[PDB]
Scaffold this active site. Structure first.
Site, PDB file in Angstrom:
ATOM      1  CG  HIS A  61     -29.252  30.489  -3.471  1.00 26.12           C
ATOM      2  ND1 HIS A  61     -28.454  29.629  -4.189  1.00 26.12           N
ATOM      3  CD2 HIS A  61     -29.480  31.720  -4.212  1.00 26.12           C
ATOM      4  CE1 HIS A  61     -28.333  30.180  -5.561  1.00 26.12           C
ATOM      5  NE2 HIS A  61     -29.024  31.284  -5.450  1.00 26.12           N
ATOM      6  CG  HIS A  91     -30.151  34.912   5.045  1.00 32.51           C
ATOM      7  ND1 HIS A  91     -29.864  36.105   5.089  1.00 32.51           N
ATOM      8  CD2 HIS A  91     -28.971  33.834   5.094  1.00 32.51           C
ATOM      9  CE1 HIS A  91     -28.392  35.993   4.919  1.00 32.51           C
ATOM     10  NE2 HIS A  91     -28.023  34.791   5.002  1.00 32.51           N
ATOM     11  CG  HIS A  93     -26.363  29.944   6.042  1.00 30.20           C
ATOM     12  ND1 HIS A  93     -26.265  30.160   4.734  1.00 30.20           N
ATOM     13  CD2 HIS A  93     -26.499  31.316   6.480  1.00 30.20           C
ATOM     14  CE1 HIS A  93     -26.240  31.348   4.190  1.00 30.20           C
ATOM     15  NE2 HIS A  93     -26.244  32.249   5.300  1.00 30.20           N
ATOM     16  CD  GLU A 103     -22.965  30.644   6.089  1.00 28.53           C
ATOM     17  OE1 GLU A 103     -23.179  31.844   5.807  1.00 28.53           O
ATOM     18  OE2 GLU A 103     -22.713  30.399   4.786  1.00 28.53           O
ATOM     19  CG  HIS A 116     -26.092  35.057   8.299  1.00 26.15           C
ATOM     20  ND1 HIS A 116     -25.533  34.466   7.435  1.00 26.15           N
ATOM     21  CD2 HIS A 116     -25.486  34.675   9.651  1.00 26.15           C
ATOM     22  CE1 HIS A 116     -24.453  33.656   7.766  1.00 26.15           C
ATOM     23  NE2 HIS A 116     -24.336  33.894   9.165  1.00 26.15           N
ATOM     24  CB  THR A 195     -21.237  33.521   3.709  1.00 24.76           C
ATOM     25  OG1 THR A 195     -22.605  33.259   3.858  1.00 24.76           O
ATOM     26  CG2 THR A 195     -20.939  33.901   5.224  1.00 24.76           C
TER      27      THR A 195
HETATM   28  C1  LIG Z   1     -27.030  43.399   0.452  1.00 25.94           C
HETATM   29  C2  LIG Z   1     -26.814  42.745  -0.775  1.00 25.94           C
HETATM   30  C3  LIG Z   1     -26.859  43.589  -1.928  1.00 25.94           C
HETATM   31  C4  LIG Z   1     -26.859  42.628  -2.971  1.00 25.94           C
HETATM   32  C5  LIG Z   1     -26.635  43.142  -4.388  1.00 25.94           C
HETATM   33  N1  LIG Z   1     -26.545  41.328  -3.125  1.00 25.94           N
HETATM   34  C6  LIG Z   1     -26.704  40.611  -1.784  1.00 25.94           C
HETATM   35  S1  LIG Z   1     -26.470  38.740  -1.739  1.00 25.94           S
HETATM   36  C7  LIG Z   1     -26.237  38.526  -0.104  1.00 25.94           C
HETATM   37  C8  LIG Z   1     -24.999  37.299   0.173  1.00 25.94           C
HETATM   38  F1  LIG Z   1     -24.441  37.097  -0.908  1.00 25.94           F
HETATM   39  C9  LIG Z   1     -24.691  36.920   1.496  1.00 25.94           C
HETATM   40  F2  LIG Z   1     -23.737  36.007   1.156  1.00 25.94           F
HETATM   41  C10 LIG Z   1     -25.247  37.350   2.581  1.00 25.94           C
HETATM   42  S2  LIG Z   1     -24.667  36.679   4.376  1.00 25.94           S
HETATM   43  N2  LIG Z   1     -24.940  35.107   4.167  1.00 25.94           N
HETATM   44  O1  LIG Z   1     -25.593  37.210   5.237  1.00 25.94           O
HETATM   45  O2  LIG Z   1     -23.398  37.067   4.170  1.00 25.94           O
HETATM   46  C11 LIG Z   1     -26.419  38.351   2.463  1.00 25.94           C
HETATM   47  F3  LIG Z   1     -26.839  38.855   3.396  1.00 25.94           F
HETATM   48  C12 LIG Z   1     -26.790  38.800   1.197  1.00 25.94           C
HETATM   49  F4  LIG Z   1     -27.814  39.928   1.033  1.00 25.94           F
HETATM   50  N3  LIG Z   1     -26.987  41.423  -0.630  1.00 25.94           N
HETATM   51 ZN   LIG Z   2     -26.146  34.260   5.467  1.00 33.81          ZN
END
Ligand SMILES: Cc1cc(C)nc(Sc2c(F)c(F)c(S(N)(=O)=O)c(F)c2F)n1
Ligand SMILES: [Zn+2]
Length: 257
Positions: A61, A91, A93, A103, A116, A195
């Site tokens: 992703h 990470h 986008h 985003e 992010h 997101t």
């Molecule tokens: C902290 C945590 C715990 C778990 C179980 N999944 C996730 S998946 C995740 C995610 F789906 C996101 F959308 C984001 S984000 N783009 O920064 O909003 C994220 F950082 C993520 F780490 N994150």
């Molecule tokens: Zn993100």
């Protein structure tokens, strides 16, 4: 399984993750003229001096740099936050071309990319449990514009060739995330969500007003990554962003002006 294509992209997510249509989804367009200056907001405290990066990986992703969040090494506090949030990973986008990729948007403007930096509320003990809570996560959002290079991004861009496809990873130590920050910590803030799926409504968003500049050569290296695993059909990892979601009842606060 979910992604960013025509068939499994943002418009499809609500089927597996009904909260996609909920009351505090991210990202949003930031209307700068409509954000409320809150003189009561504290300065953001970003204490990253003891940060310990461990690994970088392609999860199909995006790509993610993971930090050792087992002690208070790299923490965000103050601003709109109560308590202490620990940096777990960052990470990005990005777009298929320079005019899209972020985003969040600012007065409808899209940036080439968005960084992010993802932090969790130490009162919840772990990022997993934090994500189950309304005040569980704080994500520091930084816009990238294309221009001069960011020297502090270079260590990241130089290893991407080694994690080209989904599920590849590498050791990635002594990376300093302070080298990804702009001069100013003026910010907008609002309550929102992850997101990507599972789209939990657990995020306090803190989005920096000042973009960082990266070079075309730097962003082009992001666009060489693949969504697919090795020996599956080639699909470039580009346009891995979710569009702006309706603001609904929320107010965006500004730390400045
Ligand atoms: C902290 C945590 C715990 C778990 C179980 N999944 C996730 S998946 C995740 C995610 F789906 C996101 F959308 C984001 S984000 N783009 O920064 O909003 C994220 F950082 C993520 F780490 N994150
Ligand atoms: Zn993100």
């Amino acid at each position: 399984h979910w992604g960013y294509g025509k068939h499994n992209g943002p418009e499809h997510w609500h089927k597996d993750f009904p909260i996609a249509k909920g009351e505090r989804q991210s990202p949003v367009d930031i209307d700068t003229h409509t954000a409320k200056y809150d003189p009561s907001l504290k300065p953001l405290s970003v204490s990253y001096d003891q940060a310990t990066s461990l690994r970088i990986l392609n999860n199909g992703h995006s790509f993610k740099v993971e930090f050792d969040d087992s002690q208070d090494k790299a923490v965000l506090k103050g601003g709109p936050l109560d308590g202490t949030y620990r940096l777990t990973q960052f990470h990005f986008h990005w777009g298929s071309l320079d005019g899209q990729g972020s985003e969040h948007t600012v007065d409808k403007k899209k940036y080439a990319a968005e960084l992010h930096l993802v932090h969790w509320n130490t009162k919840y003990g772990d990022a997993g449990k934090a994500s189950q809570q309304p005040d569980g996560l704080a994500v520091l959002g930084i816009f990238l514009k294309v221009g001069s290079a960011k020297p502090g991004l270079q260590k990241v861009v130089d290893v991407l060739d080694s994690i080209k496809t989904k599920g590849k990873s590498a050791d990635f130590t002594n990376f300093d995330p302070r080298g990804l920050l702009p001069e100013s910590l003026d910010y907008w803030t609002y309550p929102g969500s992850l997101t990507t799926p599972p789209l939990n409504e657990c995020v306090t968003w803190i989005v920096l007003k000042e973009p960082i500049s990266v070079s075309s050569e730097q962003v082009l290296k992001f666009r060489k990554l693949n969504f697919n695993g090795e020996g599956e059909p080639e699909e470039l990892m580009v346009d891995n962003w979710r569009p702006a979601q309706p603001l609904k009842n929320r107010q965006i606060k500004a730390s400045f002006k």
